[PDB]
Design an enzyme around this catalytic site. Structure first.
Site, mmCIF file in Angstrom:
data_model
loop_
_atom_site.group_PDB
_atom_site.id
_atom_site.type_symbol
_atom_site.label_atom_id
_atom_site.label_comp_id
_atom_site.label_asym_id
_atom_site.label_seq_id
_atom_site.Cartn_x
_atom_site.Cartn_y
_atom_site.Cartn_z
ATOM 1 N N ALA A 72 4.808 -10.888 -6.675
ATOM 2 C CA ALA A 72 6.013 -11.455 -7.265
ATOM 3 C C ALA A 72 5.993 -11.427 -8.789
ATOM 4 O O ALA A 72 5.029 -10.976 -9.405
ATOM 5 C CB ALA A 72 6.200 -12.889 -6.765
ATOM 6 N N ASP A 119 -3.686 -6.028 -0.184
ATOM 7 C CA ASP A 119 -4.219 -7.362 0.068
ATOM 8 C C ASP A 119 -4.107 -7.770 1.539
ATOM 9 O O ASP A 119 -4.928 -8.536 2.041
ATOM 10 C CB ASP A 119 -3.529 -8.388 -0.836
ATOM 11 C CG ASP A 119 -3.872 -8.190 -2.308
ATOM 12 O OD1 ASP A 119 -4.950 -7.617 -2.598
ATOM 13 O OD2 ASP A 119 -3.075 -8.615 -3.173
ATOM 14 N N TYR A 159 1.295 -20.810 -1.913
ATOM 15 C CA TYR A 159 2.087 -19.769 -2.557
ATOM 16 C C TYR A 159 3.085 -19.003 -1.681
ATOM 17 O O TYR A 159 4.292 -19.233 -1.765
ATOM 18 C CB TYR A 159 1.145 -18.772 -3.252
ATOM 19 C CG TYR A 159 1.844 -17.851 -4.226
ATOM 20 C CD1 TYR A 159 2.410 -18.349 -5.397
ATOM 21 C CD2 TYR A 159 1.953 -16.485 -3.971
ATOM 22 C CE1 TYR A 159 3.065 -17.512 -6.295
ATOM 23 C CE2 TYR A 159 2.611 -15.633 -4.865
ATOM 24 C CZ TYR A 159 3.162 -16.153 -6.026
ATOM 25 O OH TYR A 159 3.783 -15.324 -6.933
ATOM 26 N N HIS A 173 -4.305 -6.502 -5.144
ATOM 27 C CA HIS A 173 -3.097 -6.850 -5.867
ATOM 28 C C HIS A 173 -1.876 -5.999 -5.566
ATOM 29 O O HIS A 173 -0.986 -5.840 -6.400
ATOM 30 C CB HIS A 173 -3.402 -6.906 -7.359
ATOM 31 C CG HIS A 173 -4.457 -7.911 -7.697
ATOM 32 N ND1 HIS A 173 -4.330 -9.248 -7.385
ATOM 33 C CD2 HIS A 173 -5.676 -7.771 -8.267
ATOM 34 C CE1 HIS A 173 -5.428 -9.887 -7.747
ATOM 35 N NE2 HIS A 173 -6.261 -9.014 -8.285
ATOM 36 N N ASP A 229 1.402 -10.897 2.806
ATOM 37 C CA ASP A 229 1.067 -10.994 1.397
ATOM 38 C C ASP A 229 2.294 -10.611 0.598
ATOM 39 O O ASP A 229 3.010 -9.665 0.942
ATOM 40 C CB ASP A 229 -0.094 -10.093 0.991
ATOM 41 C CG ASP A 229 -0.528 -10.345 -0.447
ATOM 42 O OD1 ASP A 229 -0.843 -11.506 -0.761
ATOM 43 O OD2 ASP A 229 -0.547 -9.405 -1.264
#
Ligand SMILES: Nc1ncnc2c1ncn2[C@H]1C[C@H](O)[C@@H](COP(=O)(O)O)O1
Ligand SMILES: Nc1ncnc2c1ncn2[C@H]1C[C@H](O)[C@@H](COP(=O)(O)O)O1
Ligand SMILES: [Mn+2]
Ligand SMILES: [Mn+2]
Ligand SMILES: [Mn+2]
Ligand SMILES: [Mn+2]
EC number: 3.1.11.2
Lengths: 220, 218
Positions: B17, B184, B121, B179, B14
């Site tokens: 960014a 995560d 992503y 988050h 994970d």
């Protein structure tokens, strides 16, 4: 040297006690910049709330296959065993691990100081022995180290007791530590006790930090 | 089917960014949690949250981006360019790559990265960060899969597929702390431990070379 810019909290799990010429089975590093520490809210109350860990931290936790089996005592408290580590393909303490450790350390602003509970008697000498078994030069030859037992002892007397990780935590916070005897769990608990008096701890570390290169190996 | 044999290691990944895809975002936090296939072998309504395996390797690193984070990003991830610099975090560099390389080397092959929405992503973004480094990519021999497709498949067997939505639906519990890269990653591990064998078989069937992942931007 100057002020330590990064404090790397460390804990190692091993096959047994010093007399058995133990080998590392787990290692956790938690790098915290001094700003994060001095930015932790001062503890107020008796007991005060458990400090909030900093948001920005670097963490590494690894399980290592020892060259020999764990003693019944080490295995029962750490929950690790050579057979389970090997069946899960864990590799021994080797050159690649040293490379990994160096790269992790290089991400941190220097100078850096390793912080380990009872590190002067256990963790530092044992790590030194593990690194001495390798061919490449030690990646810790520019890193400082300090034992948090001496630190908390000073902090407590400035504010006979057992200075074990859990005893101190319980004394300070009147709460029970979690995941004891696991490298990450113990590192997280160490972080919390060092956050008790952030400024005082940082100052003590700055005054007592010494080169890890001066650490004598536990055994040859 | 085993297009690449049984995966011996699943590396849950994970990334946090600066922002969304169209912003040509840069990674600010990265976490890898490597679990051996054997470890994944670990009725309630709902069932209790599976305990994570004892043996695991974990890497969580914060990174200073070349540009500021969008308010939305900084607000949920709790990270900002200013604070990361105050904490003296370094930019995504070759040392970072060497670190990842050595970390991966400790894991038995073949290894498969697992990320929720990774195909759109994380993987593309990761490819971009590594591509612009002097060090060649240390992931060219690594595989990857998106856990969104996986969970959709598993749930097919008996609407929203966001990490948080799936976790709650399955465990009637809120994820520990969302988050945050590590937060995560642990949540992802939990949902993948929902149906271990099924998840493992699905991963073995859909794993593809990370080398084929096209970067998010150049
Ligand atoms: N009673 C006993 N028998 C054998 N080996 C032991 C014992 N107590 C500690 N140790 C060794 C093995 C642990 O992983 C290590 C660090 O303990 P820690 O405190 O968790 O960091 O010290
Ligand atoms: N609302 C909003 N604004 C800007 N950037 C965002 C937003 N939501 C997610 N992101 C970006 C920044 C996060 O660190 C990353 C991964 O979120 P993850 O949760 O791990 O999927 O996606
Ligand atoms: Mn210890
Ligand atoms: Mn310990
Ligand atoms: Mn994500
Ligand atoms: Mn995230």
């Amino acid at each position: 040297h100057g002020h330590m810019q990064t404090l790397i909290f460390l804990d190692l799990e091993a096959t047994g006690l010093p007399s058995s010429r133990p080998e590392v089975t787990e290692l956790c590093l938690l790098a915290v910049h001094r700003r994060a520490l001095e930015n932790t809210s001062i503890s107020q109350g008796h007991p005060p709330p458990v400090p909030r860990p900093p948001r920005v931290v670097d963490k590494l936790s690894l399980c290592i296959a020892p060259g020999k089996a764990c003693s019944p005592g080490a295995s029962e408290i750490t929950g690790l065993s050579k057979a389970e580590l090997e069946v899960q393909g864990r590799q021994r303490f080797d050159d690649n691990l040293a490379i990994l450790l160096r790269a992790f350390l290089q991400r941190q602003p220097q100078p850096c100081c390793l912080v380990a509970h009872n590190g002067d008697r256990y963790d530092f000498p044992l790590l030194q022995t593990e690194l001495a078994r390798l061919s490449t030069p030690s990646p810790l030859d520019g890193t400082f180290c300090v034992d948090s037992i001496a630190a908390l002892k000073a902090l407590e007397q400035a504010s006979r007791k057992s200075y074990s990780l859990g005893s101190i935590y319980t004394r300070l916070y009147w709460q029970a530590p979690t995941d004891s005897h696991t490298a990450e769990g113990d590192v997280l608990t160490l972080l919390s006790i060092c956050q008790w008096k952030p400024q005082a701890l940082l100052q003590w570390v700055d005054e007592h930090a010494r080169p890890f290169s001066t650490v004598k190996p536990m055994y040859g």
